[PDB]
Design a protein around this nucleic acid. Sequence first.
DNA 1: CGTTTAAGCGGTTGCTAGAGCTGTCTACGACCAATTGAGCGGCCTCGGCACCGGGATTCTCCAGGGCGGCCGCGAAAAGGG
Length: 49
Amino acid sequence: FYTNPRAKGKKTMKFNVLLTTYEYILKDRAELGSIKWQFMAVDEAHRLK
DNA sequence: CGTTTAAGCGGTTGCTAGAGCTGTCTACGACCAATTGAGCGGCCTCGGCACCGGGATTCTCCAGGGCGGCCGCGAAAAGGG
């Protein structure tokens, strides 16, 4: 995730696109909600109906 | 300890049960008065068990009649002087 993971400060990102599923969104919402996302793409949006 | 499997969580999709609210009404139960008949106590009487007097029935005992054994006793046959 982090370009500088050993630093104690605000760590910048290293990746560009993160592919995930719904289960790990509901499992790791605390570790993924504190990221300033620029774009979001949700496949099979009828699950979000 | 290795492996499988089913619990846990999230999700669909419609209908129905049930809680809550508002409204109406009707049968049902509280209430009261008059009444009376079912419950509690006593009083009287019979069914059955028991007590007492009287009469019929069977078992035990005392006395009479007959028979056996003794007690010397006494008439009689045989021996002796």
